[PDB]
């Protein structure tokens, strides 16, 4: 409630310059890594001025730059100063193992027909290389000149090749939503040749719409890879993954249209940890959505749980859940911009409760206020590999300020257990669910990040908070459906696992036990009895990895 939760390090770690944290205006922010070394890099989007890429470097204690103003550099090609960047995202879109680098560029636009194309950055010829507007690809119809805001990676088919949703801002009947992907039959690797396509249209998301924020993962399939889009000036769509490469909307079914307000940050989460996916949103001076899954009348329908404090309106940008204090609940971070009044940055505790629903508890984000912080962008990583994730706020739009940086203060002593799924070719499992089964907590849920929050795009790690707690095991699903589930040795707590793509006895802790297919599932204790409940209570209930006991 009461202790600041963040303490900025902007000064030691990313001091304000001219070469690394320049006092600009930034948009989007994505994690990834750029040079195949196994730590991630921080990718800004410069809105009027270059793209940053942000490299930790241990020696110094800083984020360093490595986008710098030489022409012979081979990350040259990113710095991009005559885009004016807004949306970036990360993504293995031709199955090499390695991510591509998306801006969505909306130069002399606020809507409609922009000026600049959009960029998609690959490494080759020993450098980064614009594909979307190179010989192969530039009579494809896959760079337009459209204004738009977020972009994510969508593993449409579950092939391990990632499409790219591009989330444009139509004027009228001008500038449809895209997917762009890697046309196979066109292409020829070998020879780096790299042909595009948009299939937004027989894909079913060719829509004039509004667009903000993005999401990808599970939300209503099992392992398939839907997409939340949060609209302004119209509803949200809630796209189905069909299993054929194709989307159906239901959000008006769902309940999560929302058609009178305007989104901006989103994030994917499960804060009652019932294994269904939660939806949580900013709205543009509106009530902000804490939206959970349920099953009312044996069909999909959310529920909006936020508080009166949580759904205050505010010019909310950048939305972000995570456990930043590895207590084992989620913190939802809202980074508001402060364009015409001061307009702190506000946290929440989201508390997973037995009986009901979760209690959402106000929190001191500490340095993290920024009353007068004009944020745009920002993203969660543990950069420094402590175990601890940082946050780092980009600003921007109606004044130039620098990046910060925040570490937070709180949890040391409490256990955590990053997890890194691979593709089937060696990329960042993106849009993967990850499940944590914990000896005595049950059921933890994350999605990798393949775009959320508003122009961002975070870490590609599930990253677990298990408090006093322990791990027993843990289960990926690719967006294909292949699940694999691996115990957690007790000599991996506290570390981060890579777990790879298939080509010791299963522990699944207390409330969940192994099936006849081989993965954890839901103990039900009412048929599994020794008879569980008292004299005083004795109907049993049955929940996903507990049980209550009634009269
Ligand atoms: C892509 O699949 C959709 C959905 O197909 C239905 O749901 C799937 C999960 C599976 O159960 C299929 O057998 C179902 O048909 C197709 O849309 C359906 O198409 C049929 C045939 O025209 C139609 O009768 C259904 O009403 C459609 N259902 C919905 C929900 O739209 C779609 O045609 C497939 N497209 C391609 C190109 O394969
Ligand atoms: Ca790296
Ligand atoms: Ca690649
Ligand atoms: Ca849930
Ligand atoms: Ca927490
Ligand atoms: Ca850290
Ligand atoms: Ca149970
Ligand atoms: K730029
Ligand atoms: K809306
Ligand atoms: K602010
Ligand atoms: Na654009």
């Not at 004039?208 to 398939?224: E, H, M, Q, W």
């Not at 599932?521 to 004299?535: A, G, H, K, L, S």
Request: glycine share 10%; aromatic share 10%.
């Amino acid at each position: 409630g009461s202790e600041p939760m963040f303490t900025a390090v902007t000064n030691s770690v990313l001091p304000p310059d001219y070469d690394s944290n320049p006092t600009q205006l930034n948009y989007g922010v994505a994690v990834t890594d750029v040079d195949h070394d196994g730590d991630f890099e921080i990718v800004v989007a410069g809105y009027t001025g270059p793209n940053l890429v942000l490299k930790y470097n241990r020696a110094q204690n800083r984020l360093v730059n490595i986008a710098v103003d030489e022409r012979s550099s081979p990350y040259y090609a990113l710095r991009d100063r005559q885009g004016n960047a807004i949306g970036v995202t990360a993504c293995d879109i031709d199955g090499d193992g390695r991510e591509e680098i998306y801006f969505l560029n909306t130069n002399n636009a606020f809507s409609g027909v922009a000026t600049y194309t959009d960029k998609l950055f690959k490494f080759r010829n020993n450098r980064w290389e614009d594909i979307l507007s190179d010989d192969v690809n530039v009579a494809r119809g896959v760079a337009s000149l459209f204004a738009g805001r977020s972009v994510a990676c969508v593993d449409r088919t579950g092939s391990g090749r990632y499409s790219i949703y591009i989330a444009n801002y139509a004027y009228g009947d001008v500038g449809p939503d895209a997917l762009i992907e890697m046309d196979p039959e066109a292409s020829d690797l070998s020879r780096g040749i790299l042909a595009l396509r948009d299939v937004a249209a027989e894909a079913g998301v060719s829509k004039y719409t509004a667009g903000r924020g993005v999401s990808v993962g599970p939300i209503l399939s099992s392992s398939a890879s839907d997409i939340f889009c949060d609209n302004e000036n119209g509803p949200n769509f809630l796209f189905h993954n069909q299993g054929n490469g194709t989307f159906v909307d239901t959000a008006a079914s769902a309940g999560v249209d929302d058609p009178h307000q305007h989104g901006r940050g989103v994030a994917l989460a499960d804060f009652n940890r019932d294994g269904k996916v939660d939806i949580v949103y900013g709205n543009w001076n509106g009530p902000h959505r804490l939206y959970l899954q349920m099953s009312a009348h044996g069909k999909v329908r959310f529920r909006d749980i936020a508080s009166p404090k949580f759904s205050t309106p505010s010019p909310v940008r950048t939305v972000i859940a995570a456990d930043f204090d590895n207590d084992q609940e989620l913190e939802v971070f809202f980074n508001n911009i402060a364009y015409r009044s001061s307009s702190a940055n506000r946290l929440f505790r989201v508390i997973r409760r037995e009986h009901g629903d979760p209690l959402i508890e106000e929190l001191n984000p500490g340095d993290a206020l920024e009353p007068e912080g004009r944020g745009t962008g920002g993203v969660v990583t543990d950069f420094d590999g402590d175990g601890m994730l940082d946050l780092i706020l980009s600003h921007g739009e109606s004044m130039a300020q620098p990046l910060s940086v925040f570490r937070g203060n709180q949890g040391f002593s409490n256990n955590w257990l990053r997890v890194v799924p691979r593709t089937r070719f060696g990329a960042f499992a993106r849009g993967a669910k990850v499940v944590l089964y914990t000896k005595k907590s049950g059921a933890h849920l994350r999605i990798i990040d393949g775009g959320s929050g508003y122009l961002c795009e975070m870490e590609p790690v599930a990253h677990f908070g298990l408090g006093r707690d322990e791990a027993s095991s843990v289960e990926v699903t690719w967006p294909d459906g292949k699940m694999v589930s691996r115990s957690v040795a007790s000599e991996e707590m506290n570390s981060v696992l890579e777990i790879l793509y298939p080509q010791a006895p299963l522990e699944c802790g207390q409330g969940f036990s192994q099936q006849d297919n081989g993965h954890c599932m839901d103990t039900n204790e009412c048929i599994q009895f020794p008879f569980v409940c008292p004299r005083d209570k004795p109907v049993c209930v049955n929940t996903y990895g507990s049980y209550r006991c009634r009269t």
